[PDB]
Write a protein that binds this ligand. Structure first.
Ligand SMILES: NC(=O)c1ccc[n+]([C@@H]2O[C@H](COP(=O)([O-])OP(=O)(O)OC[C@H]3O[C@@H](n4cnc5c(N)ncnc54)[C@H](O)[C@@H]3O)[C@@H](O)[C@H]2O)c1
Ligand SMILES: NC(=O)c1ccc[n+]([C@@H]2O[C@H](COP(=O)([O-])OP(=O)(O)OC[C@H]3O[C@@H](n4cnc5c(N)ncnc54)[C@H](O)[C@@H]3O)[C@@H](O)[C@H]2O)c1
Ligand SMILES: [Ca+2]
Ligand SMILES: [Ca+2]
Ligand SMILES: [Ca+2]
Ligand code: NA
Ligand code: NA
Lengths: 413, 407, 414
């Protein structure tokens, strides 16, 4: 089904390089990651027996600043996937013009199969094995699929044994350990700010549309909530265990309460249970993938009903699907812009930490809006001077900014 | 003895479990180091310096350095633990510490005190730090002491202005530092009063003590229209039922005048201050002044504890029965430690604030802290003293639990 | 060896200010000795593979008030006494405007015009390798100077960061795309105007009240002239050392700016009258602003100056004989150590923005610049009253006393 994640991302990178006319030698430098790290992570389970994993940290580019990107605990984590995600962070940070490069990490494990004490030990061992490589001004992790603010607390705590109290070494922290107000909701809310900027160009409002949402974690819950509050009609939601639909709109606040009491989507009373395999091809105006990458591919792209796709997940649409969907008249707001709210507020968390003084939530949200608005305006102008679609307008915008910084730094030893 | 019972009560109010409680009572780290220097005449003297680092779950530790003899370890430990709670009460990102040198600084020359300070810094240079443990002045030490610690520490770790607070302005100290505690008392009083719908401008005040805290609090009250009807210090007292002209009074103190010889009031017995007719009583000078003998004769309906522990538990109950509200010391006099945080912030950001910004941030922190204390009081159905204690204790507990325990 | 304009001015001024303050002679001796002097071998392969060896250097004069600060000159004339004097002057200058730095000065004895861009980059990176442990965000923060520029700073940043991690604050003057500050090009000229505004307020006058003659039309002259023009000042004469134009109605500085943009020269400009650039300093005006050159006011022309105010934007336009004649004529001289400090003040702001991890917009940079410059004038004015002295000594006594106080508070025991 899914195209190789790194093959897909490199095809977009090649398409973007051609638009900019990049010299092949500069292009090759920008493609190769700065550093790839794979480390053994062996822990005792709660009964004392050993389990061994491999942890990864791919540091793709640091021309524009310390590297930035989250840590995924998921059974399909592998070098290709982490490499593709890391490269995308390099472009995304540059799209929103925050002073970071790109990185990504992960462990190939299933968190549902580990106890909370095992997850803590695994997280601390991973931190021990990379403590030299990450750092406030080197590489700053954060959550991603299968990790959360408690995971980041353990990274902070273990890292600080080696280098002293270092709040800014990781973002997505709990509020009570130096996290930023607004960070938990930031990706989902930024999706909404990105969607509003796009709909403004077409003269539409969120309240005009129906929505289908794949995935219901940190990104999908906050995105659905924010859409729901602004009058959007959310007609289907899936997660790994099932899905729920309602053509008149799901009461998202009620669905989230039901979820917080350990209810499953399929059992929610204000909707009809559905097969999650039918989510991406469900009738809707706007489709928002909020789970795995590569899920829109040559096999299902012709059956997409949506007129808009908002890429909240990282690389949910492969290049085969891009072209099919373009010919169906579908507009795709690309991941490196639409889901950048998270890393943007991560930047603000990091700033607050190094300034030793936290901001109020209204300032975090004012700055998020300003960053997301400016990035969209830059993409629009870039699509014009280069006469390209939104994915390429954002991709070339970030790639060109990375090239500039790379060229200023130079190459002598 | 009463301190351990009090911590247990606060712990049980919060529902902490015994294992967490035991951990919170054990200090993170205790250090003692030999400090030997040549005297001015070349002969040696040897002292022991120490630092009790109580807790660092919420950030770098913070606390004073005392140059004073007759060191009592139990009392040093108690004060380090108190700083852990106090920093959490006003929500500044520090834990608690206390240190010192067992010496009598009156017996040392200024060059001997400098050498002793530098040697002590040499002996603890890897255990203090901008993000590790940030000392401050205390009994027997001052901003000059801090300057020497900074200078010697920076030889080891590079220029590190935020390694200590209380610095001279000329070496990175903060504007507003001298007035911080007295002014913070007043911002705290304004927050308390607004909760009852009252304003400083409609209250009368009696103030015990006219030193660093009492002078600045009186000034700030006077400038907000408060009527200061009585003031005492160690040598005398002065009363005026229509309000003392505090600007005039501060001028008279500067010229080495006495409170009793001030013309803008009537001299009074300083032993009569706490029982003076007023709306608001502010003990600023001494602890242990309100006890079972005099608490029934207090006439104020609000007591603002600027001094540390002015009120014993007998008095607390007596005054509660009389419907008196007591703003507790741990919060009310926290403006000094709060501005010390701002000093550290300004240092780390490399860019100092003007005095207006320091004072606005101080008012902001003191106001939010009051509202957090009051909300906690509603949650646990307790008075302000216990509400403040449980707020601080719970914040430390929460950070500790989030950090976790696996190696 | 011991004789350039900046050496004589600084040690004359240091000595005079030290006596006004009554500084102890042992403290004075310590303040004159630099903290540390560094010379390092810098050998590189040229593009053709052959070696060349230069000597790089950094004089670190004083750090009582903070990390040291100062430029890196790539220039073949290296005069050790002049380098020391300039590092010392930065110590006083930073103190005058109350920025938390001491002074330094460094460079490489080379002619950068003989080197390719790749050679300059290797030379810069090797120099950085040789001094990486002696500079740093909280130790010593270089900046551009004669023969170096923002590209030079990018290379220092990049190489230094190999040894210590990303360290944007290790140098100022960076490209905007690598953490440089907005407002840098205008900073010195705009600061001159902020300083002039403060001075004139003391007389209850405004720039719109005055006529101006400006010597120099480079980075400082253009921006000062632009900012004066926009505030209603009448710029009646401008010289660029090669030509000069006079207009008693006021020159249209906007028109003159566009003309310089069209690669025209001052003598080419049609919106005024031909004048001899050597007559600029004695031109009729209320305010004279020497921007381009030093030593130009001397005992032979001081008495023909017509201005009531002299704003020393350039470094050291006024020699000792002229300074005396002009004071006796009643002329008020805003001294260079203060008046042109806008550049170093905004370099302080760049370091702050880097340390804070978040860049300011240009409006904020310029509000902060005006605040720093205004407060420094008021402090200088206070010191003039305390010591009954002219503005130049009010400034030097202010900066010297701030360094002395910080030194005495830090103390002397080991
Ligand atoms: N967390 C952030 O700040 C952030 C920022 C930008 C983008 N992203 C991206 O958003 C996506 C989701 O991240 P998250 O933080 O929400 O993760 P999460 O672990 O919080 O939740 C992931 C969600 O996806 C669901 N899911 C997993 N496999 C699925 C499948 N096969 N079908 C349907 N649903 C499935 C899970 O059940 C869960 O509801 C990822 O691509 C991530 O990289 C995350
Ligand atoms: N930042 C701070 O100064 C700070 C911080 C926390 C707590 N406190 C509390 O405030 C108290 C006062 O601190 P300070 O800096 O104002 O001290 P200070 O030495 O500057 O002034 C003390 C004042 O108390 C008076 N006094 C002493 N004994 C008295 C007595 N028996 N009756 C009446 N007046 C008497 C003195 O004459 C003087 O007026 C401390 O002892 C402590 O309890 C101070
Ligand atoms: Ca690369
Ligand atoms: Ca011994
Ligand atoms: Ca010296
Ligand atoms: Na001696
Ligand atoms: Na070559």
């Amino acid at each position: 089904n899914a195209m190789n994640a790194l093959v897909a991302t490199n095809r977009n990178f090649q398409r973007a390089s051609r638009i900019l006319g990049l010299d092949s030698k500069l292009e090759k430098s920008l493609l190769i990651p700065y550093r790839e790290i794979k480390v053994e992570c062996t822990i005792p389970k709660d009964d004392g027996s050993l389990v061994s994993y491999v942890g990864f940290r791919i540091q793709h580019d640091n021309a524009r600043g310390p590297m930035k990107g989250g840590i995924r605990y998921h059974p399909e984590v592998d070098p290709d996937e982490v490499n593709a995600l890391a490269q995308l962070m390099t472009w995304k940070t540059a799209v929103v013009d925050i002073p970071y490069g790109g990185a990504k990490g992960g462990i190939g494990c299933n968190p549902k199969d580990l106890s909370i004490s095992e997850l803590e030990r695994l997280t601390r061992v991973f931190t021990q094995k990379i403590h030299d490589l990450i750092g406030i001004h080197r590489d700053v992790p954060a959550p991603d699929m299968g990790t959360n603010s408690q995971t980041m607390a353990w990274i902070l705590d273990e890292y600080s044994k080696f280098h002293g109290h270092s709040p800014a070494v990781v973002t997505g922290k709990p509020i009570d350990l130096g996290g930023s107000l607004g960070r938990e909701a930031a990706t989902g809310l930024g999706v909404v700010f990105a969607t509003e900027a796009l709909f403004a160009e077409y003269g539409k409002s969120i309240s005009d549309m129906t929505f289908a949402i794949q995935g219901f974690g940190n990104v999908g819950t906050w995105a659905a909530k924010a859409i729901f509050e602004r009058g959007g009609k959310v007609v289907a939601v899936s997660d790994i265990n099932g899905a729920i639909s309602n053509p008149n709109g799901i009461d998202i606040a009620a669905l989230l309460k039901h979820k917080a009491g350990n209810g499953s989507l399929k059992d929610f009373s204000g909707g009809d249970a559905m097969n999650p395999n039918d989510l991406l091809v469900h009738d809707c105006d706007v489709l928002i993938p909020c789970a795995l990458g590569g899920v829109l591919n040559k096999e299902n792209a012709n059956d997409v009903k949506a007129k808009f796709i908002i890429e909240a997940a990282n690389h949910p649409t492969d290049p085969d699907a891009d072209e099919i969907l373009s010919k169906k008249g579908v507009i795709i707001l690309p991941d490196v812009y639409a889901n950048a709210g998270g890393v943007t507020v991560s930047y603000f968390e990091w700033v607050q930490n190094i300034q030793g003084f936290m901001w109020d939530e209204e300032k975090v949200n004012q700055e998020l809006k300003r960053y997301m608005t400016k990035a969209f305006n830059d993409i629009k102008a870039n699509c014009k001077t280069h006469n390209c679609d939104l994915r390429m307008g954002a991709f070339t915008l970030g790639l060109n900014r990375v090239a500039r910084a790379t060229l200023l730094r130079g190459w002598e030893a």
